[PDB]
Amino acid sequence: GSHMWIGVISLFPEMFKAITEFGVTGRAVKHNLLKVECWNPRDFTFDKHKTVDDRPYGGGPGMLMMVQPLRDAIHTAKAAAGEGAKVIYLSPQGRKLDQGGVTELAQNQKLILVCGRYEGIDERLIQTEIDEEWSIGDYVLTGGELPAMTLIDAVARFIPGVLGDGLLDCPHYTRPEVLEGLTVPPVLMSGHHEEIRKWRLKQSLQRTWLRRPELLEGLALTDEQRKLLKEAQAEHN
């Protein structure tokens, strides 16, 4: 159906086995709903030692990705992708990823994800080769590979066939009925589907209010949600 092709530029393509070989994403790859293809800048070097890093102009402690191997790898991935592929660079300086941003990225049938190492890539390559710069969160990692895999996993959930409202999820319970003295809320045993739906929605509203109140500010609550939230806040007091 709406399959997705993701090209990856990475010095450590074997890291991507974590998503291509296991779980829901591994099944998506096996079933051809998701295709992940990697190019390694090390394969585009020409010197004896296959050098992939370079020193920044102006000095400093860190290194950058060497331009020539990385640029050639990107160009090769773009040629394999054809037209319509969006090239994404993962960095702390990028647009912060959220579920809304995931749904936007999932609209692309083709993506190329550039995984920086060291202190990242040359600023001019961002200008000449990168369409969009994204961050998975306000923290620093040793490479863009984990952010790239996180993005792949999140967008894969929107591909039809891969899987089997602004609020945090409600609590969930399974067997057994009592666990270290803690019982399951009786409503979940009642079999009354409408009471269960309202209980879960009310719990999601209460949990969002208590834990992430700023998420509620970005929402236009329905009539039902306004009432259940008021009830939850009244019981809390």
Place this chain on the structure above:
Amino acid sequence: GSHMWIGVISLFPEMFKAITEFGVTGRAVKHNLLKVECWNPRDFTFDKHKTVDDRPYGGGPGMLMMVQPLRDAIHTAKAAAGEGAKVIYLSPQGRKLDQGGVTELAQNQKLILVCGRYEGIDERLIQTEIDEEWSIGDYVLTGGELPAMTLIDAVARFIPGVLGDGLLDCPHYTRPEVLEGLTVPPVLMSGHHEEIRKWRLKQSLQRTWLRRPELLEGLALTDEQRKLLKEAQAEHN
């Protein structure tokens, strides 16, 4: 020195090869600065088919992790960890991870990371077994493994020997001197270390202001930073 031990509870322990076998984190593991030990709930099942999921009370589309295998795996990891280990559950409902939160978590010499699959774990296990619940970002994934690896990588950077201010990083440049007509800022060639430091700081301030203005609100800028930021905003106008 300040080595770190991280126990992991996961149905897919082989995903963690992505951090234990490659790059800076793989070296940290090889050098015994970081130890990652995994327990798989599937090994704690007793039925013929090694069942690790269970149905939620109250119905619904999703499944939960089965309590008994997961609980036994957690208890085994806690016994291997000894005293002082903090047990962390990765979920979208958790505290949002940022670099400040990474530095807090890195203060622990021992961590146990519980990786949920399906719709997560029973709420009572969070109450009885989990010390802290964290999220790597406001998006949903197919498992907690990628969040757990992201956390491991971020905290590993604070372990002394693993590697070789609230603002986004400045642009960086490497060879060649001209790339598709784009030149390197002459100051970075000048060799004047003080001018380079001020240029980079000014660029970091300008970039944070243009891209993530809310990050500036949480900062008490130094005298030098206030001046360079004013200069950047004046040149922008």
